[PDB]
Each structure stands twice: as structure tokens, then as C-alpha cells.
């Protein structure tokens, strides 16, 4: 449901072809929130039970409103966390090709990590999801020293934090469609682009 811990639970000797790591926003329960778990069941159908992990980043990332105003989005603790996921992924799964996630804070956080990611793990991630992308407008929609082709930003009209501003409206809370059909859509296209099928 809201917690998926696949990749810390998962066996190294019948790893995943796939996985999958993602950041909740704001004040959200579990390790996924109201938008992983919709993400997770179509992974799920596209690559079966077996073939994907999903994996929220938890730990110390406590998705704390008040460290949005923090420099990078997110705190240092956050981002310690999330790049600690994607090398226990490169560590425990060396074949596994990887795709990323996030909504809100958890989207600068997603950034953040990857921005710092040692290029060799970095490089393995074949595509990642942002919604209500709170640096968005600071960042370009882009994130730092990844491909704008593996990239692809959820930004509603009238979503406040993707124009610059912390400022939670409606639109920011309106991205359900988005994970339940084009967001999935958009990791199983590039993981199929390099895998094959
Ligand atoms: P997103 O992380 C929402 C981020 C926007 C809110 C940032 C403002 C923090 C200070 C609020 C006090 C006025 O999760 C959905």
C-alpha cells in the first residue's frame, strides 16, 4: 500500500529487472504516498510482481513541510537517504535497470539526489517522473546533470511551486490522472527503450 520497502527487503540472489525509487511529498504517509502507489500497480502489470521493486525512500526522509524553504528543497538528511537507496540498488543489483520518482519536496528531493549520484549509477536510471516539481522553475524543468529525455515534469497550470513560489493551491493536489496514466507510461517507454521487451 503506502510502504514498499522492495528493494530493502528483496533478495540479492532473484533480483528485479527493475527498480523503482520514489519520494512522497509533504506530510504524506508512508513511504509513498497519495501518488507511488497508483505508479506501483502499473509497474507491476507491465513488468509483473517479480520483475519490478518498488521502493519509497523513508529512513530519515520525514518530508517535513517546513524544509521546502531549505536551499536544495529538501534537507541534507533527505538527500543522505535517497542517494544511500540508489547505491544499495547499484550494490545489490548490478544488472537492475533503475527509474525514479517524485512529487513536491519529494521531487526536489529526487533531483537533489540525483544531481549528486555518482555518474556510473546515474547513468542507470532510465527515466524519472516529477510532479508538482518545486524547482521547476529554478532548475529550468530540468534536473542537474541528467538527460532532458529521460525527464518528465508534471507542472498543472495554477500549481504555484512549479512558478516559483511555496505557495500549496489546488492544482498542486491534482496530479492523481497523471500517476495513474501518463507518468507510468512514461518509465515502462524507457525501460523498454534500453531493455528491449
Ligand atoms: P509538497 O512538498 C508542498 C511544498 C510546498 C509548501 C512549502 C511551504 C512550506 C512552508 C509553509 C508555511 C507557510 O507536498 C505536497
Redesign the pocket.
Known amino acids: 500500500r503506502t510502504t514498499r520497502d522492495d528493494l530493502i527487503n528483496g533478495n540479492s540472489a532473484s533480483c528485479a529487472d527493475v527498480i523503482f525509487i520514489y519520494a512522497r ?4 504517509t508512508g513511504n509513498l504516498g497519495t501518488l507511488g502507489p497508483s505508479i506501483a500497480s502499473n509497474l507491476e502489470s507491465a513488468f509483473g510482481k517479480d520483475g519490478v521493486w518498488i521502493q519509497g525512500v523513508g529512513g530519515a526522509y520525514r ?1 517535513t ?2 524544509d ?2 531549505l536551499p536544495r528543497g529538501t534537507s541534507s538528511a533527505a538527500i543522505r537517504e535517497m542517494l544511500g537507496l540508489f547505491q544499495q540498488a547499484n550494490t545489490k543489483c548490478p544488472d537492475a535497470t533503475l527509474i525514479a520518482g517524485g ?4 521531487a ?1 528531493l529526487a533531483a537533489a539526489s540525483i544531481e549528486d549520484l555518482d555518474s556510473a549509477i546515474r547513468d542507470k536510471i532510465a527515466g524519472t517522473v516529477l510532479f ?1 516539481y ?1 524547482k521547476n522553475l529554478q532548475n529550468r524543468g530540468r534536473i542537474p546533470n541528467y538527460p532532458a529525455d529521460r525527464t518528465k515534469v508534471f507542472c498543472n497550470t495554477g500549481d504555484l ?1 512549479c512558478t516559483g513560489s ?3 493551491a489546488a492544482p ?2 491534482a496530479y492523481g490522472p497523471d500517476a495513474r496514466g501518463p507518468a507510468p507510461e512514461f518509465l515502462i517507454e524507457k525501460v523498454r527503450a534500453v531493455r528491449g521487451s
Do not use: M
Request: negative net charge.
Open positions: 511529498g509533504s506530510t504524506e518530508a513541510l517546513g521546502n524553504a512529487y513536491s519536496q519529494g526536489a508538482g518545486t511551486v511555496l505557495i500549496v498542486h493536489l
